[PDB]
Tab-separated table of N, CA and C in Angstrom:
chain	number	residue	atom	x	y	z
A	1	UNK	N	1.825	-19.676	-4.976
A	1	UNK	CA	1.965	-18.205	-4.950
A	1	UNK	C	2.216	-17.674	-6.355
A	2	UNK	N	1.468	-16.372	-6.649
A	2	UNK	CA	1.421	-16.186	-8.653
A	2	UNK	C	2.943	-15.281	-8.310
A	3	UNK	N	3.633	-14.272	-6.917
A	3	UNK	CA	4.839	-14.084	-7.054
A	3	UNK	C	4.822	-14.171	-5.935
A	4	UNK	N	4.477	-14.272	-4.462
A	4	UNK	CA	4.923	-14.196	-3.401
A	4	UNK	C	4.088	-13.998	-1.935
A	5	UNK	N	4.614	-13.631	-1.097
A	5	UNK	CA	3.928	-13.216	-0.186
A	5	UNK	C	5.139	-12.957	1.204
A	6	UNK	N	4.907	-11.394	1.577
A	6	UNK	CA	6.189	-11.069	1.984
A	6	UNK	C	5.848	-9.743	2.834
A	7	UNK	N	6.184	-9.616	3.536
A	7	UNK	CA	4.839	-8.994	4.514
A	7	UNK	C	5.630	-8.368	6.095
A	8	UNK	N	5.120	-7.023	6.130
A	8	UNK	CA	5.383	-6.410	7.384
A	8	UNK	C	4.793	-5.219	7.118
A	9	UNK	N	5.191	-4.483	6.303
A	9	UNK	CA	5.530	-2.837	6.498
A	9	UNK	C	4.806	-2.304	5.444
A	10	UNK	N	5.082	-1.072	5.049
A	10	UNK	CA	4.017	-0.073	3.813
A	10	UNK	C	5.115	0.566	4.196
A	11	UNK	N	4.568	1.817	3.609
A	11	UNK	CA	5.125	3.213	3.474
A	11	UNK	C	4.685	3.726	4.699
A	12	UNK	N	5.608	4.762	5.128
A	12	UNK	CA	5.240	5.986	6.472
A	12	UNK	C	4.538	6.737	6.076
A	13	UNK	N	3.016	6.857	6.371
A	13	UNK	CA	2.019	8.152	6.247
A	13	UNK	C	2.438	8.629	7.614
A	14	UNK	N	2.632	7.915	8.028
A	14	UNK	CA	3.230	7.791	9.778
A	14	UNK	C	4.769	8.706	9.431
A	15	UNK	N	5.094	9.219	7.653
A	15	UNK	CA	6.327	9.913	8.169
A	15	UNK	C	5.778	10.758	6.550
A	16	UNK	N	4.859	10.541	5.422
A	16	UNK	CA	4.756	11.214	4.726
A	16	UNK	C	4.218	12.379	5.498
A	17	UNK	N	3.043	11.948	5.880
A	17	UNK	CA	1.858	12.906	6.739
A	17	UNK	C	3.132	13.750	8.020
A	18	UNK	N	3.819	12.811	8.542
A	18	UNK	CA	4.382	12.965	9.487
A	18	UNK	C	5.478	14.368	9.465
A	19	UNK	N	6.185	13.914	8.178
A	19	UNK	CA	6.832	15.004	7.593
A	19	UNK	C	6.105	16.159	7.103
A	20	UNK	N	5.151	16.119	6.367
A	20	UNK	CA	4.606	17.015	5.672
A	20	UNK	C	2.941	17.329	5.457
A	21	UNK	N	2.495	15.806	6.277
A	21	UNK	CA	0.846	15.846	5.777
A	21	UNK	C	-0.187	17.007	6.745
A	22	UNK	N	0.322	16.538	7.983
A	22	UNK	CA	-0.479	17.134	9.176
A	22	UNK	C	-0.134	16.767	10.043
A	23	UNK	N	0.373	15.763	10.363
A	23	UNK	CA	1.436	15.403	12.046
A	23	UNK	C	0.746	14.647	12.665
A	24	UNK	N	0.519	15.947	13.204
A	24	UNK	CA	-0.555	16.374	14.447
A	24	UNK	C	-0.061	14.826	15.183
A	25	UNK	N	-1.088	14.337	16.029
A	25	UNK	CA	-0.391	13.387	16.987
A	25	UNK	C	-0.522	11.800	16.343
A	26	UNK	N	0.300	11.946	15.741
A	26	UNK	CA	0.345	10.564	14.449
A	26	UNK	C	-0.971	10.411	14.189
A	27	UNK	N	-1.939	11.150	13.595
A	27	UNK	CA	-3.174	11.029	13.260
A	27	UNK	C	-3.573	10.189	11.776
A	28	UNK	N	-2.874	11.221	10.642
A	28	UNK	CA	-2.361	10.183	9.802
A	28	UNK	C	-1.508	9.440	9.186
A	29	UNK	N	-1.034	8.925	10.268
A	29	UNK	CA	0.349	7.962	10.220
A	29	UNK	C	-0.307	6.693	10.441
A	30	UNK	N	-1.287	6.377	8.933
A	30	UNK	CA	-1.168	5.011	8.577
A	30	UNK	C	0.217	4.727	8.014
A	31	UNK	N	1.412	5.170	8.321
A	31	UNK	CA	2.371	4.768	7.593
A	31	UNK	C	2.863	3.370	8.782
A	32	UNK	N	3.209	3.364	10.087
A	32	UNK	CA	3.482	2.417	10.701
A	32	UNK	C	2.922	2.116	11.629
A	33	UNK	N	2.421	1.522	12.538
A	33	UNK	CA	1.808	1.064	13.674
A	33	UNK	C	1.182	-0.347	13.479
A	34	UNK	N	1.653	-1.591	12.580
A	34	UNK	CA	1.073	-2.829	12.624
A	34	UNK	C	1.987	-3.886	11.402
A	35	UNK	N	1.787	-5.047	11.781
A	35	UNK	CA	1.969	-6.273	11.772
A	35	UNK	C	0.742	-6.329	10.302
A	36	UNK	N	1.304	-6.985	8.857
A	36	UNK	CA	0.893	-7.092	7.846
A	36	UNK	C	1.651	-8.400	7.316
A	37	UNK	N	0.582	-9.435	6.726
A	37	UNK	CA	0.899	-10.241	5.700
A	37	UNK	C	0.589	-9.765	4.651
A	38	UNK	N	1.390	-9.831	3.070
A	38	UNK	CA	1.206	-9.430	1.668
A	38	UNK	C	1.330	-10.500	1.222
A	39	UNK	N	0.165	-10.969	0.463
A	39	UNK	CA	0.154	-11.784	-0.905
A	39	UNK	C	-0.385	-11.415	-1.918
A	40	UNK	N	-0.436	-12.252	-3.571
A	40	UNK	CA	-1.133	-11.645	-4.540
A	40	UNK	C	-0.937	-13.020	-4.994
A	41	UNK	N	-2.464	-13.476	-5.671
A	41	UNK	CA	-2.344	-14.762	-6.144
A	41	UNK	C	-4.020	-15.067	-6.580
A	42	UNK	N	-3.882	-15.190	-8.136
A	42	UNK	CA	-5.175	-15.255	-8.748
A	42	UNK	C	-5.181	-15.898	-10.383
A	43	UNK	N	-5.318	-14.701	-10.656
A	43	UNK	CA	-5.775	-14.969	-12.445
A	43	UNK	C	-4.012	-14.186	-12.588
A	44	UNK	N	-3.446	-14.281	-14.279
A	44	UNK	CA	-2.513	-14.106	-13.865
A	44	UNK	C	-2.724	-12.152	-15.259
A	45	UNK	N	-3.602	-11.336	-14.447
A	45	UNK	CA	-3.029	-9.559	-14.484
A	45	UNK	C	-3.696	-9.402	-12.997
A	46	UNK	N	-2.795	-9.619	-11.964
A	46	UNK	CA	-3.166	-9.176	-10.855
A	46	UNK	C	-2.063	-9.562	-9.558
A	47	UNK	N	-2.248	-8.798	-8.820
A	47	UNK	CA	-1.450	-9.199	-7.159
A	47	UNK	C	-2.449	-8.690	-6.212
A	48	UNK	N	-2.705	-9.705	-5.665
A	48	UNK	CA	-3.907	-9.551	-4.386
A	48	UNK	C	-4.035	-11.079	-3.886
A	49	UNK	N	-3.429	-10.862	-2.788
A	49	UNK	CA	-3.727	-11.841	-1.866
A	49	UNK	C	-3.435	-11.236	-0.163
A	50	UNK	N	-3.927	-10.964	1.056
A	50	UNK	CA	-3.369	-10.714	1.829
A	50	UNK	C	-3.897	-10.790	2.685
A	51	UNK	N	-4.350	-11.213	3.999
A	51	UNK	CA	-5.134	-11.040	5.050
A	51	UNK	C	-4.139	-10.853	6.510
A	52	UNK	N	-3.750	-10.299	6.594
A	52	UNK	CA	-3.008	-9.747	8.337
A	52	UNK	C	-2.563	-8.023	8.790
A	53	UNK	N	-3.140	-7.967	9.361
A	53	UNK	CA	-2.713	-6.347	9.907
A	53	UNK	C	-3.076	-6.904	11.466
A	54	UNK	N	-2.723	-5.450	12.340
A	54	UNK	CA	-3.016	-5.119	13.769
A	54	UNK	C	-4.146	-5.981	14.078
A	55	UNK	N	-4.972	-5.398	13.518
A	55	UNK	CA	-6.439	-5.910	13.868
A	55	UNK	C	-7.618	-6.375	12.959
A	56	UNK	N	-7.428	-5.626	11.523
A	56	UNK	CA	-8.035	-6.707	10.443
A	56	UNK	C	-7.238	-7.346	9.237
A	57	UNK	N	-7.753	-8.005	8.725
A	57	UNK	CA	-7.090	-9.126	7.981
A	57	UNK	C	-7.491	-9.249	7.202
A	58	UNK	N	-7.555	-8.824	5.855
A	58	UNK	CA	-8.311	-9.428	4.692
A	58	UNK	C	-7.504	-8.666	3.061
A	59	UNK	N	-6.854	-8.721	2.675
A	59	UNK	CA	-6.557	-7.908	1.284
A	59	UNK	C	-6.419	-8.832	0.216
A	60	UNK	N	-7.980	-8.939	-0.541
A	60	UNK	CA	-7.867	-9.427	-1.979
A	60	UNK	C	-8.491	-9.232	-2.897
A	61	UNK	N	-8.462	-8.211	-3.538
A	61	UNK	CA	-9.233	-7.607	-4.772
A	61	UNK	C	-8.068	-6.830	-5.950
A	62	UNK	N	-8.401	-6.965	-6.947
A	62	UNK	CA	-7.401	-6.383	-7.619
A	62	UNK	C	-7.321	-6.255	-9.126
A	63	UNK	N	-6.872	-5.759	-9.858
A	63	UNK	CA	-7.159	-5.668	-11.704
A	63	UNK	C	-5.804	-5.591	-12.046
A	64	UNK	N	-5.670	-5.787	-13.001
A	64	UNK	CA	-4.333	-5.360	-13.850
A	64	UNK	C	-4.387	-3.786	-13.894
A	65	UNK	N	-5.031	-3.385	-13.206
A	65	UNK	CA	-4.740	-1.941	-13.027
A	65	UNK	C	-5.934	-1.143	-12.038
A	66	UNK	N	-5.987	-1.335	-10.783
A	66	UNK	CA	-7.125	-0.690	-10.034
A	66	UNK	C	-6.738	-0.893	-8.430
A	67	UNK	N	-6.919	-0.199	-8.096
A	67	UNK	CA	-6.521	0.489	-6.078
A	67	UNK	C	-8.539	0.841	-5.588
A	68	UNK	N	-8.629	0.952	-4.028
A	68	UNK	CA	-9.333	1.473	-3.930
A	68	UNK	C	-9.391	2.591	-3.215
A	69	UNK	N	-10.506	3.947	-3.030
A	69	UNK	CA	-10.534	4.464	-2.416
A	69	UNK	C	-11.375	4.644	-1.000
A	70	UNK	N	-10.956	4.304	0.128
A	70	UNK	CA	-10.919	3.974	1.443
A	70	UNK	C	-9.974	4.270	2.890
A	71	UNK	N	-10.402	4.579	3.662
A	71	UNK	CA	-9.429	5.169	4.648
A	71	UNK	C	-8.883	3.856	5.175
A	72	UNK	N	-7.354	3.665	4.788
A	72	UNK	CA	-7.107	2.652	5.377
A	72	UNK	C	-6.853	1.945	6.807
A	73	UNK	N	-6.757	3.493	7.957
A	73	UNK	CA	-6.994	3.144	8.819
A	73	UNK	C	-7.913	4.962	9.869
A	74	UNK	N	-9.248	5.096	9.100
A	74	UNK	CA	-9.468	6.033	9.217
A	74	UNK	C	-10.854	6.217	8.207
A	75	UNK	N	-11.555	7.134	8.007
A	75	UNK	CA	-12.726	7.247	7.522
A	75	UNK	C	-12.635	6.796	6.092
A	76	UNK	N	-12.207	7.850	5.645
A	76	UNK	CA	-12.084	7.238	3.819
A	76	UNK	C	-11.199	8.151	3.336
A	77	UNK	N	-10.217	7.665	2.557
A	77	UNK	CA	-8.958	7.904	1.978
A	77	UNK	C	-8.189	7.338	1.437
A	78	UNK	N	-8.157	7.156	-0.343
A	78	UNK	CA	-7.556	6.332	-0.534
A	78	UNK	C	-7.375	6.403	-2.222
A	79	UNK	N	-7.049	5.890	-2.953
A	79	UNK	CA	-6.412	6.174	-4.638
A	79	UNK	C	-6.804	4.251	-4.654
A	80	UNK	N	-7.691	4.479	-6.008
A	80	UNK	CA	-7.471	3.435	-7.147
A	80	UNK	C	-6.544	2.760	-8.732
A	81	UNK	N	-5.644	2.373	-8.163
A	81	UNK	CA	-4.760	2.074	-9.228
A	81	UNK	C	-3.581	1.353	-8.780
A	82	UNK	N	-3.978	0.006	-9.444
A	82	UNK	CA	-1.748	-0.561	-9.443
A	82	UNK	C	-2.252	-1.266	-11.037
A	83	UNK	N	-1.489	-1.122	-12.044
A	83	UNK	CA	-1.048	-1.511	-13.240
A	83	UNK	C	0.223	-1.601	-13.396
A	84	UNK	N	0.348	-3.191	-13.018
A	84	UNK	CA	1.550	-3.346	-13.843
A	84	UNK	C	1.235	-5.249	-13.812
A	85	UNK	N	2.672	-6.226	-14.481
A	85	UNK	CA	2.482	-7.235	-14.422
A	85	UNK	C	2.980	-7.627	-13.086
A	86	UNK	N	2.697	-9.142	-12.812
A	86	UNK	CA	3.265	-9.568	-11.319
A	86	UNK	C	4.687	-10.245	-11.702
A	87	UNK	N	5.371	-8.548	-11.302
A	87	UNK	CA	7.020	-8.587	-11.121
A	87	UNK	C	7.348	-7.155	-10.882
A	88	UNK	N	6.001	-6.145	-10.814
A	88	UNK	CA	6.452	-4.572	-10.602
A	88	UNK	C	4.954	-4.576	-10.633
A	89	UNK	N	5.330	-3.149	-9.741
A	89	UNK	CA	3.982	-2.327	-9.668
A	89	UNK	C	3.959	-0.991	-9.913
A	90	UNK	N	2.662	-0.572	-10.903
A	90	UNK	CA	2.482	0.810	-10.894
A	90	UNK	C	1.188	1.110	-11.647
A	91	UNK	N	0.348	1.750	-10.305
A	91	UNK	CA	-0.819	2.053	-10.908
A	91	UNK	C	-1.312	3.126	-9.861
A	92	UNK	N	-2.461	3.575	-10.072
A	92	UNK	CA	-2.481	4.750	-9.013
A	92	UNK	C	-3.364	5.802	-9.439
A	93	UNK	N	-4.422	6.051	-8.357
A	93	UNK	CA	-5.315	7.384	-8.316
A	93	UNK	C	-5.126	8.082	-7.102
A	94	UNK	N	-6.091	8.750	-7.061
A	94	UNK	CA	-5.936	9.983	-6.262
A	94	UNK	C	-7.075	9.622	-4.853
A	95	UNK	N	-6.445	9.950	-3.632
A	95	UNK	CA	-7.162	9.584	-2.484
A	95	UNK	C	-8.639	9.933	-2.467
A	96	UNK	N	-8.890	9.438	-1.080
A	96	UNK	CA	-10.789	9.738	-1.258
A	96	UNK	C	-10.512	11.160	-0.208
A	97	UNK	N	-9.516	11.635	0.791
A	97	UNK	CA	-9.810	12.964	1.968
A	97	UNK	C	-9.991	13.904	0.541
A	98	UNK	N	-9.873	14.397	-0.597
A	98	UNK	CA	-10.404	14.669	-1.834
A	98	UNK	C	-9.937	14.272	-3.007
A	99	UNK	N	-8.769	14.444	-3.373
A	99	UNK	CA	-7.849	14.015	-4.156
A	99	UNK	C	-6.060	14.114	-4.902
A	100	UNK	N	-5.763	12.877	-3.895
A	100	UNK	CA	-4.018	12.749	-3.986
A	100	UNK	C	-4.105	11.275	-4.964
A	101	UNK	N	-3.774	11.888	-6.208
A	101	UNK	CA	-3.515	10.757	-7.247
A	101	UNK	C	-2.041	10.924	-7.325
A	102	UNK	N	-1.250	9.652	-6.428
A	102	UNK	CA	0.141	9.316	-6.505
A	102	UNK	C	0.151	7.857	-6.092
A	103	UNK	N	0.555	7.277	-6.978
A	103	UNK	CA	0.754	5.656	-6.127
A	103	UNK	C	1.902	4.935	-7.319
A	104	UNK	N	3.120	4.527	-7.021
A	104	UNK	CA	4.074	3.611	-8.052
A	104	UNK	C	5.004	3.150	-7.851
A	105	UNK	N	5.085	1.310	-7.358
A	105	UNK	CA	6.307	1.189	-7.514
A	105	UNK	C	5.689	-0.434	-7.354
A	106	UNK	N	6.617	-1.128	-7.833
A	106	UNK	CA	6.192	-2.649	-6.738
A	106	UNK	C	7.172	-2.624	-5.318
A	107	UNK	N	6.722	-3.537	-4.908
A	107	UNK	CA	7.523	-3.677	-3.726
A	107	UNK	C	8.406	-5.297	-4.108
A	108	UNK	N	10.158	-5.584	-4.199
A	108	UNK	CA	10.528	-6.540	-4.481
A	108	UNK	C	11.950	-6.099	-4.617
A	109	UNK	N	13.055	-7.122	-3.999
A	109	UNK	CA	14.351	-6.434	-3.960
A	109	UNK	C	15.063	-8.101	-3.548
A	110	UNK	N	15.336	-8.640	-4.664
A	110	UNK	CA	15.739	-9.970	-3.844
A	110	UNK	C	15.097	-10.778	-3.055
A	111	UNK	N	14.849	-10.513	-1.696
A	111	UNK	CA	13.573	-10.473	-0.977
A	111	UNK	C	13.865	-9.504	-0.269
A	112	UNK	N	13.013	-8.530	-0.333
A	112	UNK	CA	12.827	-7.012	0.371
A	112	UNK	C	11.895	-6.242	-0.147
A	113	UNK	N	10.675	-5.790	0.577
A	113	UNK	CA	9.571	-5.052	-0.568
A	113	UNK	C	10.158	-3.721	-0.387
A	114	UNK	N	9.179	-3.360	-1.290
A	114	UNK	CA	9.249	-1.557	-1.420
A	114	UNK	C	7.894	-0.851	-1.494
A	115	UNK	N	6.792	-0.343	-0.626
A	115	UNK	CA	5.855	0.208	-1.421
A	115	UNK	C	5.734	1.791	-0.960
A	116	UNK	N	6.085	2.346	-2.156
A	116	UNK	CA	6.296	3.594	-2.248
A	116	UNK	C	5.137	4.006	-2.956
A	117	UNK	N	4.085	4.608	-1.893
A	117	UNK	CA	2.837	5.364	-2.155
A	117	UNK	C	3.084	6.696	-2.350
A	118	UNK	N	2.496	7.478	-3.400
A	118	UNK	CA	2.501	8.744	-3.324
A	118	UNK	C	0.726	9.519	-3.014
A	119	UNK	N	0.931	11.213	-3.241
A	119	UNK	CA	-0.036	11.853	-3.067
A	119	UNK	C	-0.196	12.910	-3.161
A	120	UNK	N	-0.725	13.780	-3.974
A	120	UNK	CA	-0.323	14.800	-4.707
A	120	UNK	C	1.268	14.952	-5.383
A	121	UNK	N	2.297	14.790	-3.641
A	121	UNK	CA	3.568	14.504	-4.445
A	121	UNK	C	4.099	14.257	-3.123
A	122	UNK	N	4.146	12.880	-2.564
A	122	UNK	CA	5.051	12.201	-1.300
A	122	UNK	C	4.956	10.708	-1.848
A	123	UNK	N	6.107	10.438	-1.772
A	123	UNK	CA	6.630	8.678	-2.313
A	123	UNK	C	7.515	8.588	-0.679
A	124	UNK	N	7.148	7.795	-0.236
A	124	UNK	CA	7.624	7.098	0.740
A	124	UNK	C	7.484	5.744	1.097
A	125	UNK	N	8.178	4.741	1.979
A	125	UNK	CA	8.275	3.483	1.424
A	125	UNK	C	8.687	2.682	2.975
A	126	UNK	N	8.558	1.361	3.570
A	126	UNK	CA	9.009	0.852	4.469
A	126	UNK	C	8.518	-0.533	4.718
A	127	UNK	N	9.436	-1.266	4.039
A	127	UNK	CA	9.214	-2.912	4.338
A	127	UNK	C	11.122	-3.354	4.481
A	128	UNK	N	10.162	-4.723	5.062
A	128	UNK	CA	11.561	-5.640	5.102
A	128	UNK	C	10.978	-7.376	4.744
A	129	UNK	N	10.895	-7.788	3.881
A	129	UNK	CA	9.699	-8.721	3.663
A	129	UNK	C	10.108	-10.172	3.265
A	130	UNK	N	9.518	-11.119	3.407
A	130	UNK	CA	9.271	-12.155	2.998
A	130	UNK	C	10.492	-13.225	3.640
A	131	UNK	N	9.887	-14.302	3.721
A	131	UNK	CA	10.872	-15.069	4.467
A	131	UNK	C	11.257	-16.190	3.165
């Protein structure tokens, strides 16, 4: 492992959106509703390794500084950017529904992630990670 792999949770769109995005009937509340493994493990300017959610499984692409834009659980929506080294994260563009460039933090706390996505301007955050 290049730092880990530690895995459950993201951030609440499920409480950014929820709070403030559009609600509506947890529509975009990719913030919670699934079961996630996180890894990152490659060349060493990068963190990407991951394959587990609800129902698909696959997360590994990544730069010393690049996100993509894609609906992560939904048409397309999404910011390109994480720059930082593997021990923090911060990198970040602006979504694809047109454009929310907010994304910064790593996720890591002893063992405990953190990933606090933003968007235009919502940082919200929800893991409990790694065994």
């Amino acid at each position: 492992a290049f730092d880990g792999t530690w895995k459950v949770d993201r951030n609440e769109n499920y409480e950014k959106f929820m709070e403030k995005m559009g609600i509506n009937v947890v529509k975009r509340k990719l913030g919670a509703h699934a079961n996630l493994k996180l890894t990152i493990t490659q060349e060493g300017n990068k963190f990407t390794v991951k394959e587990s959610s609800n129902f698909r499984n696959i997360d590994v692409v990544f730069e010393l500084g690049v996100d993509f834009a894609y609906s992560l659980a939904d048409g397309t929506e999404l910011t390109g950017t994480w720059t930082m080294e593997g021990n923090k994260l911060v990198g970040k563009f602006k979504r694809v529904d047109n454009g929310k460039e907010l994304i910064a933090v790593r996720e890591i706390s002893g063992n405990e992630l953190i990933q606090t996505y933003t968007y235009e301007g919502v940082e919200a955050k929800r893991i409990f990670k790694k065994e």
